[PDB]
Enzyme design. Structure first.
Site, PDB file in Angstrom:
ATOM      1  N   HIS A  42       0.801  -1.214   0.000  1.00  0.00           N
ATOM      2  CA  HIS A  42       0.000   0.000   0.000  1.00  0.00           C
ATOM      3  C   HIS A  42       0.838   1.270   0.000  1.00  0.00           C
ATOM      4  O   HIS A  42       0.338   2.350  -0.290  1.00  0.00           O
ATOM      5  CB  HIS A  42      -0.994   0.015   1.183  1.00  0.00           C
ATOM      6  CG  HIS A  42      -0.436   0.555   2.467  1.00  0.00           C
ATOM      7  ND1 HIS A  42      -0.068  -0.259   3.517  1.00  0.00           N
ATOM      8  CD2 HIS A  42      -0.249   1.827   2.896  1.00  0.00           C
ATOM      9  CE1 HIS A  42       0.316   0.488   4.538  1.00  0.00           C
ATOM     10  NE2 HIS A  42       0.216   1.757   4.187  1.00  0.00           N
ATOM     11  N   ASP A  88      -0.782  -7.197   1.798  1.00  0.00           N
ATOM     12  CA  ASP A  88      -0.082  -5.923   1.891  1.00  0.00           C
ATOM     13  C   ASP A  88       1.417  -6.192   2.014  1.00  0.00           C
ATOM     14  O   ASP A  88       1.994  -6.086   3.102  1.00  0.00           O
ATOM     15  CB  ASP A  88      -0.595  -5.139   3.105  1.00  0.00           C
ATOM     16  CG  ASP A  88      -0.248  -3.667   3.043  1.00  0.00           C
ATOM     17  OD1 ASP A  88       0.156  -3.212   1.953  1.00  0.00           O
ATOM     18  OD2 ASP A  88      -0.388  -2.955   4.068  1.00  0.00           O
ATOM     19  N   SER A 185       4.114   2.398   8.377  1.00  0.00           N
ATOM     20  CA  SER A 185       3.672   1.387   7.422  1.00  0.00           C
ATOM     21  C   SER A 185       4.834   0.890   6.570  1.00  0.00           C
ATOM     22  O   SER A 185       5.691   1.677   6.167  1.00  0.00           O
ATOM     23  CB  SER A 185       2.586   1.955   6.499  1.00  0.00           C
ATOM     24  OG  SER A 185       1.443   2.353   7.235  1.00  0.00           O
ATOM     25  N   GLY A 186       4.858  -0.414   6.297  1.00  0.00           N
ATOM     26  CA  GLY A 186       5.916  -0.979   5.487  1.00  0.00           C
ATOM     27  C   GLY A 186       7.161  -1.263   6.300  1.00  0.00           C
ATOM     28  O   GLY A 186       8.029  -2.016   5.861  1.00  0.00           O
TER      29      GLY A 186
HETATM   30  C1  IK8 Z   1      -9.266   1.451   2.846  1.00  0.00           C
HETATM   31  N1  IK8 Z   1     -10.441   0.916   3.542  1.00  0.00           N
HETATM   32  C2  IK8 Z   1     -11.224  -0.012   2.693  1.00  0.00           C
HETATM   33  C3  IK8 Z   1     -10.366   0.715   5.023  1.00  0.00           C
HETATM   34  C4  IK8 Z   1      -9.758  -0.642   5.438  1.00  0.00           C
HETATM   35  N2  IK8 Z   1     -10.234  -1.838   4.991  1.00  0.00           N
HETATM   36  C5  IK8 Z   1      -9.460  -2.815   5.560  1.00  0.00           C
HETATM   37  C6  IK8 Z   1      -8.507  -2.188   6.372  1.00  0.00           C
HETATM   38  N3  IK8 Z   1      -8.705  -0.838   6.298  1.00  0.00           N
HETATM   39  C7  IK8 Z   1      -7.958   0.149   6.982  1.00  0.00           C
HETATM   40  C8  IK8 Z   1      -8.404   0.741   8.258  1.00  0.00           C
HETATM   41  C9  IK8 Z   1      -7.726   1.882   8.871  1.00  0.00           C
HETATM   42  C10 IK8 Z   1      -6.563   2.416   8.173  1.00  0.00           C
HETATM   43  N4  IK8 Z   1      -5.877   3.484   8.705  1.00  0.00           N
HETATM   44  C11 IK8 Z   1      -4.590   3.416   9.138  1.00  0.00           C
HETATM   45  O1  IK8 Z   1      -3.902   2.405   8.971  1.00  0.00           O
HETATM   46  C12 IK8 Z   1      -4.032   4.527   9.810  1.00  0.00           C
HETATM   47  C13 IK8 Z   1      -4.613   5.815   9.886  1.00  0.00           C
HETATM   48  C14 IK8 Z   1      -3.752   6.565  10.733  1.00  0.00           C
HETATM   49  C15 IK8 Z   1      -3.969   8.029  11.143  1.00  0.00           C
HETATM   50  F1  IK8 Z   1      -2.942   8.453  11.859  1.00  0.00           F
HETATM   51  F2  IK8 Z   1      -5.018   8.170  11.875  1.00  0.00           F
HETATM   52  F3  IK8 Z   1      -4.098   8.769  10.071  1.00  0.00           F
HETATM   53  N5  IK8 Z   1      -2.728   5.792  11.128  1.00  0.00           N
HETATM   54  N6  IK8 Z   1      -2.887   4.550  10.580  1.00  0.00           N
HETATM   55  C16 IK8 Z   1      -2.036   3.503  10.911  1.00  0.00           C
HETATM   56  C17 IK8 Z   1      -0.993   3.058   9.945  1.00  0.00           C
HETATM   57  C18 IK8 Z   1      -0.077   1.961  10.339  1.00  0.00           C
HETATM   58  C19 IK8 Z   1      -0.196   1.296  11.672  1.00  0.00           C
HETATM   59  O2  IK8 Z   1       0.462   0.291  12.249  1.00  0.00           O
HETATM   60  N7  IK8 Z   1      -0.052   0.018  13.463  1.00  0.00           N
HETATM   61  C20 IK8 Z   1      -1.090   0.872  13.699  1.00  0.00           C
HETATM   62  N8  IK8 Z   1      -1.965   0.927  14.748  1.00  0.00           N
HETATM   63  C21 IK8 Z   1      -1.237   1.736  12.588  1.00  0.00           C
HETATM   64  C22 IK8 Z   1      -2.161   2.827  12.241  1.00  0.00           C
HETATM   65  C23 IK8 Z   1      -6.128   1.802   6.929  1.00  0.00           C
HETATM   66  F4  IK8 Z   1      -5.037   2.289   6.343  1.00  0.00           F
HETATM   67  C24 IK8 Z   1      -6.788   0.686   6.311  1.00  0.00           C
END
Ligand code: IK8
Lengths: 234, 52
Positions: A42, A88, A185-186
């Site tokens: 992603h 992913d 991420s990643g």
């Molecule tokens: C795209 N849609 C379909 C939603 C979805 N479907 C399946 C899974 N997801 C899904 C749900 C939440 C997120 N949204 C984040 O992933 C996100 C938003 C933010 C913020 F900061 F709010 F913008 N931060 N993250 C994040 C990134 C890496 C992480 O690694 N460990 C964690 N807790 C963590 C948190 C996503 F990136 C995908």
């Protein structure tokens, strides 16, 4: 990374940072070998052009060990979809080899069976990155690492608003204010065994960061070991 | 309990073959003479924090 501490000298040598044209990190990665970087599929949707920086712990100073690398090949898992965030995973082949030195070294790829029985049953894993230090804040200028507990699969599936597929696993805390976050991420999720660190996951996603009742979702590397082996030839 | 019993005494990978433990290492490591310990073949082996 929310909570946790700074990676001290030489502690997270396998951390890689995907930098955009404006030269800023937008995602992490893990050094697998002199030519390959492991990251989230992603993340390849976060910049039209990017490079990989290694040996960096402070983006504000030139610690001397930093090295930027151009990407020669991007190997994204064909089954990845942003609709589910399933599969992913991606491997990057660099144009020039990474020369290992202080703060620049690879993490070990384990064997599936052994990793799932021995590594993933350990109390914790280690996640790291330059991502946000709070859900509503800025990306850190310092490389952080955080020890995250392996979370019961049932518990985590119950806690998720989205389907946790067989290619994902949960790690983190129910309520404690520590978690990976946007920007990590990643990046690497490794598990230490007898002072040797093995790659066990890829920071993938989470509903916010450090939110009560929510966990960090990571790509289960042990489910892609054969895929990684093959990619590391393309 | 073989591999269940303290990782079969292996430094890294453990396999159970014919009720016997078989140790192995990650790429870049050599199984020591005792057939348990893993020795780095060259500098900067994988999984090790850097000291120099
Ligand atoms: C795209 N849609 C379909 C939603 C979805 N479907 C399946 C899974 N997801 C899904 C749900 C939440 C997120 N949204 C984040 O992933 C996100 C938003 C933010 C913020 F900061 F709010 F913008 N931060 N993250 C994040 C990134 C890496 C992480 O690694 N460990 C964690 N807790 C963590 C948190 C996503 F990136 C995908």
């Amino acid at each position: 990374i929310v909570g946790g501490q700074e990676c001290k000298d030489g502690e997270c040598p396998w951390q890689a940072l995907l930098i955009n044209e404006e030269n800023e990190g937008f995602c992490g990665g893990t050094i697998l070998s002199e030519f390959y970087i492991l990251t989230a599929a992603h993340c390849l949707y976060q910049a039209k052009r990017f490079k990989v920086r290694v040996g960096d712990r402070n983006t504000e100073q030139e610690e001397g060990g930093e090295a930027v690398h151009e990407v020669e090949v991007v190997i994204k898992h064909n089954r990845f979809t942003k609709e589910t965030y399933d599969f992913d995973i991606a491997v990057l082949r660099l144009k020039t080899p990474i020369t290992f030195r202080m703060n620049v070294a690879p993490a070990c790829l384990p064997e599936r069976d052994w990793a799932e029985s021995t590594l993933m049953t350990q109390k914790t894993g280690i996640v790291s990155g330059f991502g946000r230090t709070h859900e509503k804040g800025r990306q850190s200028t310092r490389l952080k690492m955080l020890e995250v507990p392996y979370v019961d699969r049932n518990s985590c599936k119950l806690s998720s608003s989205f389907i946790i597929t067989q290619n994902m696993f949960c790690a983190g805390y129910d309520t404690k204010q520590e978690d990976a976050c946007q920007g990590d991420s990643g990046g690497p999720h490794v598990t230490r065994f007898k002072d040797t660190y093995f790659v066990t996951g890829i920071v993938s996603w989470g509903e916010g960061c450090a939110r009560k009742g929510k966990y960090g979702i990571y790509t289960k590397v042990t489910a892609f070991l054969k895929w990684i082996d093959r990619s590391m030839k393309t | 309990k073989l591999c269940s019993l303290d990782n079969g005494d292996c430094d890294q990978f453990c396999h159970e073959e014919q009720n016997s433990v078989v140790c192995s290492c990650a790429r870049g490591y050599t199984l020591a003479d005792n057939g348990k310990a893993c020795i780095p073949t060259g500098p900067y082996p994988c999984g090790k924090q850097t000291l120099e």
